[PDB]
Design a protein around this nucleic acid. Structure first.
Ligand SMILES: [K+]
Ligand SMILES: [K+]
Ligand SMILES: [K+]
Ligand SMILES: [K+]
Ligand SMILES: [K+]
Ligand SMILES: [K+]
Ligand SMILES: [K+]
Ligand SMILES: [K+]
Ligand SMILES: [K+]
Ligand SMILES: [K+]
Ligand SMILES: [K+]
Ligand SMILES: [K+]
Ligand SMILES: [K+]
Ligand SMILES: [K+]
Ligand SMILES: [Mg+2]
Ligand SMILES: [Mg+2]
Length: 1328
RNA sequence: AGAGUCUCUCAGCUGGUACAGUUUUAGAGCUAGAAAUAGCAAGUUAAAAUAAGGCUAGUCCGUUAUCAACUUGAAAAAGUG
DNA sequence: CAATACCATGTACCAGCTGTGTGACTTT
DNA sequence: CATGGTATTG
């Protein structure tokens, strides 16, 4: 008995089917377990497992990270309170107690209700003197008087609790960042370099202009407007633009041929500046550094909007400025409305529900919403002009705690913290001794390379301690081994050398590693001149001369440099042909040139004895990112370089790791030669073997040593470690579990073949890619055309912005209002490359202007547009892949071989994850070896792409309509098995391409015509009825009988669709903290916080339901009453219930619980009632639809054709259209089937009647549109959670199943993973 | 079937921080009326919690992955049509 | 109990490692 | 998002 398996692997489904010799699906009688009168059932061997998408670990991680955050912020406060403990006890022995219980209601408070002082008089006086915390912070920073210890704590706690970000390194000078003085010094540094062309900056108010609440470009234009004879694109203008955070281009200033675009935010700027400074000299370093300082001052002026010469608390001062202008503007705003229109006053200042001032302070109105609600109310009135200016600057009626306070660095809070400590350490001796300890609390943060401060109970931790004691902010440098921990942070993630599995991989930028990559490429170069008979390799001398002369003097080596600076200069060749490298060498001694600039000792770099030291310095620069730690590690060589060079060495940091170890490159040696790998790359006679040849050569001992160097996951573990979406990995494991069961079903007989086919908030990302691209481009298109992230979901508008509002084939502007008239065109034609991503797509006025349509854009378009494309590439508005394709016509365009490859890739799957599934299945099936110790491939694992079966369906009218039911998953798998087996049966030579295990015109023709053998006529040409294998003579396909077989299988109504039951996990409930309410739905946020007094959560998530048969007390009498009901065990209750189910249930009220009748009921548990009606458990108190509507095939194909689902010849198109119109009565028949089914299992009288009326209303509608909208109707009958749907313009809301009472007496069905094995439990026989 | 390199792209996993939001309390509302309410005044801030919580008590852990039923079995697992 | 309606924590930055598909050079 | 929780209204 022989058979094959077909699989369809998706992210929510695994379709499966068993086929025989004749492409038939078998049917078996299967045992049925349980207490029903049915002992067995007939099942077709075809079905599909359905499951909810697997989730990533990200959300779990972000929540984990926040938890740690909250724990450590509490610890900071506890540290500070510990310091204050004894001395605060002398002043107020319950202060910290009133703070701790501030949340409680006075009924539960054990102390007085006024937290700071403990009486109403002092408390009210406090708030009158210090309405915001920032008033108190400024007073404590400025005043010279002794202050109450409790107010000192509150100001220091507020700074430590909300301490600001750590994005800036070093200390901040609040007086050294004066915008006027940094602008004056930029002017002075410019006038030094350009004495003949100086700028008159007198009368220019640099402070107001650059610190103004305006866009960077507008402030730039404002300042230049004050300077006559200076343009914003001149050198000075560009420097101001750099200061404002824009991205200017200094190429045109210094007459450069290449482009020096500079932005101060990019990580590349440090190199970007040095690179520019290399061309124009170091005299300009003072100019470009002076501009950097100005930027710092302007950034601070966004935060500090107050003169820093009247207070040492400019931040708190600026918060107080917000409060004062809020108060003044509120007084005036009220007066205006009071007089100009008093009818709206009640709506504005008293209605929390409205987005007025009441809703903005007391309700849920945000600043953005408040501004919207009040913008017309201001425009409508008189005297509102200044307020309207503040509203448009987003600076009206501001609160102090706002979304934009993320700008504040921690150095500013620290400055006020250190000032207060300096003021009060004069009166309190414990503040002078703990001044630094308190300062450390605010400033300390765990280094990212240290991680959780665990003690052997964190699977996430790696930190190692220098001593076993409690870590605090003050002892961290001593208890935590920062060096070892920083090393583990990387070495626990990096790859080992695959060849030498115990050797660590070299840093990517290691000098030795780059010597290797350059010699390995250089060794395969070949050249030929006139006198030479044939091309030749480079000798060891030639390669060394080339490395010394070119690679050690030029960052990148082009072929031109090789020809002129080597072959002409040295070999005296006026002409030479080069091979093995094109345009320029891909490898380069980059680190060599970085170190030559820093240390300026070329002879040190070339001395081989320094190889070790240089290797350790680069390793240290790569391994660590902390500049102190880097400095500490490089101390060993402080004697070798100047302090200036050592400082420059500290600042140079590298990232990335190679793929080979040092031991492999330049350690192990060949036994007879005594030479390392690098030695052979430098010199290997006239064979010039490269890395691949060396480690594979049997005449050397490298290969032997590799195998000796080499040194068991579970199925689940192995799948977890695959590179791919966790979603697809869930289906991969489910697939293997499906195959195991199917083999057990066939009496442990292995199949002949297994054919597998695998399926194929971004608006935040799409917006960020256009902002960066446009600001890098320097364009004002976002100014002229504001856009929201949601709109960028539209393809044409997204392409418009990525192309900066220009046609991509013609150098012209595009109209944003005309996009409907424009064309979206594929760079590589979709006839060749089925790619619809933005990466192969282009917005043009008309696709005609691309050129010819059988190739990549014409040469003329490339000549026209290459430069504009280059800008888009650098602005990252197109990728390198998109630019390369866009420009291929200048590289010959698409070749015939390229076209052959494209067609082949349409048919042969090459994705790595697909190969891994095949390898998993192949290694599970084929386990025995033959006389030659080679694997015996009893089972052939075939992998197909989705296009094969999809074209099969459209070619033989086996159409699919996904919306009808879930059967198409199972049918896809059947067709995969059929097509896959028949394909390799017809052409056994294909096995190399389609089975796992180990002229261009011809292949193009061949692969385009590979599937013709199924057809009876082609294009013209005709074929036999019976198709056979040429060699064996065996029949593979009968075009009369075998299509009928397929048609029978797709028509079968019984298909085993199983929805994987799953225990729900994750969050306990909705996260929203709700206000207090008298409802038992509310759940306490802490053990003692009664939700009736404090609010809390609701909407818990049921992990699984439980069938309880027990008795419950009834009435005031408490008489025991027998019941049977469903209890949802929430995720939070789950551990408590499982530890002791009986105690848990008795706590809930149940008595005499029949412990053995407790049934665990996860989500999607399956119940059958009367007339075949099936329900799935959505929750403990809601149900989902549990039936599939097996619509007959004739209707399915009619719906597909009538609806124009997806082309064919005209004689075919008209034949299909004629069939649609000849079978128009099918429309009513389809409705009848739906209604017959809805009345049998759906049971939504209201919705069914509403739909019938809607269908009888739109009978005069076109047939195509009636069919398209019949497709929507299957939502009413679709398996799963009910949902809303629209028939034409009528909307049908979901009818839900809000009670689970009926399943308590129905038949519960437990299914195996295929659903072929069943246990059925009559629940009516329980509770008697 | 792979391997190294160059320019990239997309994805996965981990760590260190920040700002808001929400919730309860505190921030004496006034006047006139028995009240009902009306007319006003006010508003910007803070503490605390931010999965209940756990023992292993760490400045640690708590939302990913995995899961029909039955039989033996503390459990892990294997077995069952 | 129907039918019906409303609701659902969000944002920002920094430091890493891995594999992926891409199209080029070289190779087993 | 989409689907389960919750309340309101009849
Ligand atoms: K993170
Ligand atoms: K009390
Ligand atoms: K000017
Ligand atoms: K608000
Ligand atoms: K409040
Ligand atoms: K106005
Ligand atoms: K707030
Ligand atoms: K190249
Ligand atoms: K580094
Ligand atoms: K020195
Ligand atoms: K789960
Ligand atoms: K579980
Ligand atoms: K199941
Ligand atoms: K990469
Ligand atoms: Mg906690
Ligand atoms: Mg807050």
């Amino acid at each position: 008995k022989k058979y094959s398996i077909g699989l369809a692997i998706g992210t929510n489904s695994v379709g499966w089917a068993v086929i025989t010799d004749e492409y038939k699906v078998p049917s078996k009688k299967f045992k049925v377990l349980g207490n029903t009168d049915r002992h067995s059932i007939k099942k077709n061997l075809i079905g599909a497992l359905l499951f909810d998408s697997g989730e990533t670990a990200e959300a779990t991680r972000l929540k984990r990270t926040a938890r740690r955050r909250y724990t450590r912020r509490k610890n900071r406060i506890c540290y500070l309170q510990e310091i204050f403990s004894n001395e605060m006890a002398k002043v107020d022995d319950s202060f910290f107690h009133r703070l701790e219980e501030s949340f409680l209601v006075e009924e539960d408070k054990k102390h007085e209700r006024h937290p700071i002082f403990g009486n109403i008089v002092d408390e009210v006086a406090y708030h009158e003197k210090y309405p915001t915390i920032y008033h108190l912070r400024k007073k404590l920073v400025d005043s010279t008087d002794k202050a109450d210890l409790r107010l000192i704590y509150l100001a220091l706690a507020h700074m430590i609790k909300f301490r600001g970000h750590f994005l800036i390194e070093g200390d901040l000078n609040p007086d050294n960042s004066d915008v006027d003085k940094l602008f004056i010094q930029l002017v002075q540094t410019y006038n030094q370099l350009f004495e003949e062309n100086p700028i008159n900056a007198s009368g220019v108010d640099a402070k107001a202009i650059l610190s103004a609440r305006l866009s960077k470009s507008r402030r730039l234009e404002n300042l230049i407007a004050q300077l006559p004879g200076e343009k914003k694109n001149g050198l000075f203008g560009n420097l101001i633009a750099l200061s404002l955070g824009l991205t200017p281009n200094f190429k045109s200033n210094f007459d450069l041929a290449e482009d020096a675009k500079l932005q101060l935010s990019k990580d590349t700027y440090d190199d970007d500046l040095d690179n520019l400074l290399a061309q124009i000299g170091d005299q300009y370093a003072d100019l470009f550094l002076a501009a950097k300082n100005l930027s710092d001052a302007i950034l601070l002026s966004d935060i500090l909007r107050v003169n820093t010469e009247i207070t040492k608390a400019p931040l708190s001062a600026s918060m107080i400025k917000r409060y004062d202008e809020h108060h003044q503007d509120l007084t005036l705003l009220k007066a205006l409305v009071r007089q100009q229109l008093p009818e709206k006053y009640k709506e504005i200042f008293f209605d929390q529900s409205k987005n007025g001032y009441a809703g903005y302070i007391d309700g849920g109105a945000s600043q953005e919403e408040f501004y919207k609600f009040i913008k017309p109310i201001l425009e409508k009135m008189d005297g509102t002009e200044e307020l309207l200016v503040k509203l448009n600057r987003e600076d009206l009626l501001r609160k102090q705690r706002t979304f934009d306070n993320g700008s504040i660095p921690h150095q500013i809070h620290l400055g006020e913290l250190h000032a207060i400590l300096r003021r009060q350490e004069d009166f309190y001796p414990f503040l002078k001794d703990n001044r630094e300890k308190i300062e450390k609390i605010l400033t300390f943060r765990i280094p990212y390379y240290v991680g959780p401060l665990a003690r052997g109970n964190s699977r996430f931790a790696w930190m190692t301690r220098k001593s076993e004691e409690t870590i605090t902010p003050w002892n961290f440098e001593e208890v935590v081994d920062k060096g070892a921990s920083a090393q583990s942070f990387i070495e626990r993630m990096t790859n080992f050398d695959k060849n030498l599995p115990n050797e660590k991989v070299l840093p990517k930028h290691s000098l030795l590693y780059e010597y290797f990559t350059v010699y390995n490429e250089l060794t395969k170069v070949k050249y030929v001149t006139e006198g030479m008979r044939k091309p030749a390799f480079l000798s060891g001398e030639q390669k060394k001369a080339i490395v010394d002369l070119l690679f050690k003097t030029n960052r990148k080596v082009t072929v031109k440099q090789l020809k002129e600076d080597y072959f002409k200069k040295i070999e005296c060749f006026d002409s030479v042909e080069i091979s093995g490298v094109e345009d320029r060498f891909n490898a380069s001694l980059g680190t060599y040139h970085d170190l030559l600039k820093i240390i300026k000792d070329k002879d040190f770099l070339d001395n081989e004895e320094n190889e070790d030291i240089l290797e350790d310095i680069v390793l240290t620069l790569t391994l660590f990112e902390d500049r102190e730690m880097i400095e500490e590690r490089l101390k060993t060589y402080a004697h070798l370089f100047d302090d200036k060079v050592m400082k420059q060495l500290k600042r140079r940091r590298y990232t990335g790791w190679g793929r080979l170890s040092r031991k492999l490159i330049n350690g192990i040696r060949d036994k007879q030669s005594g030479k390392t790998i690098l030695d052979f790359l430098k010199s290997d006679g006239f064979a010039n073997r490269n890395f691949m040849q060396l480690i594979h050569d049997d005449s050397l001992t490298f290969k032997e040593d590799i195998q000796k160097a080499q040194v068991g996951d579970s199925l689940h573990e192995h799948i977890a470690n695959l590179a791919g979406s966790p979603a697809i990995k869930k289906g991969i494991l489910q697939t293997v579990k499906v195959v195991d069961e199917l083999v057990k079903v066939m009496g442990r007989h292995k199949p002949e073949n297994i054919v597998i086919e695998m399926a194929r908030k971004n608006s935040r990302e799409r917006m960020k890619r256009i902002e960066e691209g446009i600001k890098e481009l320097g364009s004002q298109i976002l100014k002229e055309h504001p856009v929201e992230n949601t709109q960028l979901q539209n393809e044409k508008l997204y392409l418009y912005y990525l192309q900066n509002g220009r046609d991509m084939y013609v150098d012209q502007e595009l109209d944003i209002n005309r996009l409907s008239d424009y064309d979206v065109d594929a760079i590589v034609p979709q006839s060749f490359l089925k790619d619809d991503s933005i990466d192969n797509k282009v917005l043009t006025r008309s696709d005609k202007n691309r050129g010819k349509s059988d190739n990549v854009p014409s040469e003329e378009v490339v000549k026209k547009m290459k430069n504009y494309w280059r800008q888009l590439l650098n602005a990252k508005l197109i990728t390198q892949r998109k630019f390369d394709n866009l420009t291929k016509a200048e590289r010959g365009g698409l070749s015939e071989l390229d076209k052959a490859g494209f067609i082949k890739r349409q048919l042969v799957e090459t994705r790595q994850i697909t190969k891994h599934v095949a390898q998993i299945l192949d290694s599970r099936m084929n386990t025995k070896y033959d006389e030659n110790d080679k694997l015996i491939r009893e089972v052939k694992v075939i992998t197909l792409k989705s296009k094969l079966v999809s074209d099969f369906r459209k070619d033989f009218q086996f159409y699919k309509v996904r919306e009808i039911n879930n059967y198409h998953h199972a049918h896809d798998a059947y067709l995969n098995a059929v097509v896959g087996t028949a394909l390799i049966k017809k052409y056994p030579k294909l096995e190399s391409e389609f089975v796992y295990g180990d002229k261009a015109t011809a292949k193009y023709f061949f692969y385009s015509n590979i599937m013709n053998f199924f057809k009876t006529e082609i294009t013209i040409r005709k074929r036999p009825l019976i198709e056979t294998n040429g060699e064996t003579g065996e029949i593979v396909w009968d075009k009369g009988r075998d299509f009928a077989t397929v048609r029978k299988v797709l028509s079968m109504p019984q298909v085993n669709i199983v929805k994987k039951t799953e225990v729900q996990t994750g969050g306990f409930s909705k996260e929203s903290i709700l206000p207090k309410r008298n409802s038992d739905k509310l759940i306490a946020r802490k053990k003692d916080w009664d939700p009736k007094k404090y609010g809390g959560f609701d909407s818990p998530t049921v992990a699984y339901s439980v069938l309880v048969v027990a008795k419950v007390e009834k009435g005031k009498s408490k008489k025991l009453k027998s019941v049977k009901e469903l209890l949802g065990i929430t995720i939070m209750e789950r551990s408590s219930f499982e530890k002791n189910p009986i105690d848990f249930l008795e706590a809930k009220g149940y008595k005499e619980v029949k412990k053995d009748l407790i049934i665990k009921l996860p989500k999607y548990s399956l119940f059958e009632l009367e007339n075949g009606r099936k329900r799935m458990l959505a929750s403990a108190g809601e149900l989902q639809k549990g039936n599939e509507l097996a619509l007959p095939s004739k209707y399915v194909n009619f719906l597909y054709l009538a609806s124009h689902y997806e082309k064919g010849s005209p004689e075919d198109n008209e034949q299909k259209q004629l069939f649609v119109e000849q079978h128009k009565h099918y429309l009513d028949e389809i409705i009848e089937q739906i209604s017959e089914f809805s009345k049998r299992v759906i049971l939504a009288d209201a919705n069914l009647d509403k739909v019938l009326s809607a269908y009888n209303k739109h009978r005069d509608k076109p047939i195509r549109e009636q069919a398209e909208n019949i497709i929507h109707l299957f939502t009413l009958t679709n398996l799963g959670a009910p949902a809303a749907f629209k028939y034409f313009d009528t909307t049908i809301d979901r009818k839900r199943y809000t009670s689970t009472k009926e399943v308590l007496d129905a038949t519960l069905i437990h299914q195996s993973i295929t659903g072929l094995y069943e246990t059925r439990i009559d629940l009516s026989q329980l509770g008697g």
